[PDB]
Amino acid sequence: ASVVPLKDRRLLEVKLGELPSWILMRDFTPSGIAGAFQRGYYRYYNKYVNVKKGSVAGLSMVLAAYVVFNYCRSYKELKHERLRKYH
Amino acid sequence: IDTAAKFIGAGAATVGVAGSGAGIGTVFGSMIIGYARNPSLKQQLFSYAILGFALSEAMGLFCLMVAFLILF
């Protein structure tokens, strides 16, 4: 299962930030020069447009994953919910 | 015992908010010795005082909510 999780990050790196150099990867390096940031763009609304060379959607997905992963542990403690739903 | 306990936690907290008056003595006071060497007045000189005057008051009005946090 180690080659399973290792081939997750090497797919979620070389697609959406940032596909490096070292030829045998030279045209693979310019594949990130256009970037899949245009693919990553449409989730927010439009506003994080600065991802061109400081790439927001490359980084801000991991940090959005690490928040909802830590929302699970806190859920047991801060229950607060009545015999209903909220507004 | 209830109103006894509340008030002497409130007065003994308001001592700290005049603990930042001794800083703006230096902030508003050390503008004098700077202004006499150089009269570039409406430059950042008087405006650096506002960065001193309202940041040192920002530790003055810091504890004053904490006193009223233990009023109630």
Binding site: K53, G54, V56, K85 | -
Partner: protein, 82 residues
């Protein structure tokens, strides 16, 4: 400061029109939008489950990270220089 309170109030007249022109962009999506209304329910159902707490400081640590996206469009010049 008499001039500075109007300077935000002139921005209050500025932001109400810029929100109105942004409301004109949604008026262009009166017919053709099929994206948000598929996913606006899971944020309406889970918000009916559990997600309220002492986390209004969740937005303000995400609001400050929006202002740095402004300077990130100048960080591309610091990046692509080297």
């Amino acid at each position: 400061p008499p001039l500075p309170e109007h300077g935000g109030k002139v921005r209050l007249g500025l932001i109400p029109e810029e929100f109105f022109q942004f409301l004109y962009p949604k008026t262009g999506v009166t017919g053709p939008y099929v994206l948000g209304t598929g996913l606006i329910l899971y944020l309406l159902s889970k918000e009916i489950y559990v997600i309220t707490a002492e986390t209004f400081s969740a937005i303000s640590t995400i609001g400050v990270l929006v202002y740095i996206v402004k300077k990130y469009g100048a960080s591309i010049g610091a990046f692509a220089d080297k």
